Amino acid sequence: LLNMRLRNISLKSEHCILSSLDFQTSKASEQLTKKFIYPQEHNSFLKLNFQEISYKLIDGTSQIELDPICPLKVPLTAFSYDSISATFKLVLLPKSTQPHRVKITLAYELELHPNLKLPVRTSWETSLVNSKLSNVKFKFINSNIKVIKGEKFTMRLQIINSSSSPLDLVVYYNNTINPITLENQYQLHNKYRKIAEGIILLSNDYKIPYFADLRFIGIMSGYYGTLSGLKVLDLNTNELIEVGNGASVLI
Amino acid sequence: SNPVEEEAEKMTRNSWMMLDGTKTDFHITVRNKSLSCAINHIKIIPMNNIEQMLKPDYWKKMPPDDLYIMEKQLDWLSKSCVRIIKLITFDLELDNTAVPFNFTGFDLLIEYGMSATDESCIYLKKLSIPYEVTLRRTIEV
Prior knowledge:
Chain B: Part of the multisubunit TRAPP (transport protein particle) II complex composed of BET3, BET5, TRS20, TRS23, TRS31, TRS33, TRS65, TRS120 and TRS130. Interacts directly with TRS65. Chain B: Belongs to the TRS120 family. Chain B: It is found in: Golgi apparatus, cis-Golgi network. Chain B: This is Trafficking protein particle complex II-specific subunit 120. The structure is cut from a larger assembly and holds chains A and B. By secondary structure, chain A is mainly β. Chain A has 2 helices and 17 strands. In chain A, strands 1-2-6 form a 3-stranded antiparallel β-sheet, with no helix packed on it. In chain A, strands 5-3-9 form a 3-stranded antiparallel β-sheet, with no helix packed on it. A 3-stranded antiparallel β-sheet of chain A has the order 4-7-11, with no helix packed on it. In chain A, β1 (about 5-10) and β2 (about 20) form a beta hairpin. The longest helix of chain B is centred in the middle third of the chain and has 11 residues, at about 50-60. Chain B is mostly loops. Chain B is built from 1 helix and 4 strands. The interface of A and B includes residues 56, 58, 158, 160 and 210 of A.
């Protein structure tokens, strides 16, 4: 009851799990000792944090937070350090320790020493594109990695089949503006114009019969997230499924 | 009732080139917590002993066959590159799959990695990962 602490954990699925604890000043405790401090002629507190440490709770383990920290002391404030976890596959809720050491202060003496440790479980918990018919999974072998400079480049759509008639389908890009609150008309028009006119796909109806190369050229700039347009089409009626994947800044 | 103690310790189609893969996937390495290997692996380099089996298969083929070193063994496609280690996981080594001279008889591979944390005793349990790879016929004479 001097410094309220909370830990927030965010699940970055393309990397490690990120969890950050957060100290604060706990105002419902500050006016308490503010009353006696301004009784003794002091305006704000001088609590000194001298040893702050998060340890990985286990039989025994410890971690290290993902940037640098000094030995600090603040009056009415909040601080928050971040430490990276390891992104679990399924069903193992890890736990942490989070010890701390607040050192209070008085007139060059009477440093009433305090310490605190709140151990709890660090599990807040709130690119394969499947075919959705017969598990013909597609993945780009270098997705989201392309700094092109309006030059040619090549990608790799590694199709993974049932190995049962593995020669079936054809890619294409569809350079055509799709035909679609008036600025909601205009934002959709600018999105559909920059999609259907910015890159070209130099191997158009490539008719793949399990890698591909798919050379593009890319004649306008801007971050093309999710790279729409690049559809495939297969032996059945309409397997017009997307890739929905891969991105390229072009500057 | 006689007890003991309790001691705590997917590829794709390949041509005839050489693919060097640095693997940092979800390797378990099921120790307690934060397993430091202390003698790291840099390059595993498989498809060497498969060639050291294939050239004696040629040589074994040279005379009539009487099971001198071909006696029901399907260990061509096994590819059991034993990764021996010393005393929350670590990234795997460089692959260098290196298919420059290998038969078309195989269409699969496996591996085995010796998980080791030895404290004045013998070695420990061992973990194995498979790898499915297909090959492309790029050239013939």
